[PDB]
Amino acid sequence: SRFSTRDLPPQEQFRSWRAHMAPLVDVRLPDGVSEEDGFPAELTGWHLGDLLIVQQVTPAHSYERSQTMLRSSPIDHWNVGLFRSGRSWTEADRRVTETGPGEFFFRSLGYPYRGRMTDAASILLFMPYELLADDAGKLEGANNSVLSGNLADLLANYINGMEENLGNITVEEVPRIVRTIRDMVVACVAAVRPDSQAKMGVMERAHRYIHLNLNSGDLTPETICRELGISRTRLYQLFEPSGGVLNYIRRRRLLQAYAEGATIGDWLKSV
């Protein structure tokens, strides 16, 4: 169940690192730092079903996920990230948030953000839109926040116990692991409220529209397109990674009925 990315065997390593991370974030070195110096970085990816765990070790850099990137990007995962060491500072919707050791950031990948991190080691959860779509109201209002407290210590403890046991887990367990991580996450986001510009990317808006109007039997591709302000071809593009918009709605509806050179973009497909 293994995939790995590092740049210790090359020598112009930042350029490679930037390529691998491009679908998610545009990255740049800190002012002053030459590409000569090198850029020792590691990503390590585990698929617990749909939910992706990534162990990241990285030097100081800056990052942007922009509006332009969001117009075309099929990525809208809920991102939760814990720092073992290091510190990030992240701007989104004109507000800066600082995440330090033993704390989590929470962010949707459908909203843009700018930031910087020091050198750091983190463990990152990427959860597909639908995992947490039920509590999406609170999650939109809490975008780019820090999780600290016992409630974050709890989540950290669970993730640490899991990390140690990665590569011994077994599938039977996974669906329950995914469920307590969902519950723990959504519980953490019960956090002090800010007060909203909200320039959401197409895919997050599409996945939400679908979630809200799933039982509307007139949920065609035409209505979605109209109600995003977008063409039929753009909808097809966003959904070509996951078999198409009709294929997706059928899989979603199937589940509603139930119980009644590589990059990180490739890791975020989960097919």
TrEMBL record:
This is Transcriptional regulator TRANSCRIPTION REGULATOR protein. It comes from Rhizobium meliloti (strain 1021) (Ensifer meliloti). InterPro entries: AraC_XylS_family_regulators, Homeodomain-like_sf, HTH_AraC. SUPFAM superfamilies: Homeodomain-like (SSF46689). SMART domains: HTH_ARAC. Keywords: DNA-binding, Plasmid, Transcription, Transcription regulation. GO terms for molecular function: DNA-binding transcription factor activity; sequence-specific DNA binding. PROSITE patterns: HTH_ARAC_FAMILY_2.
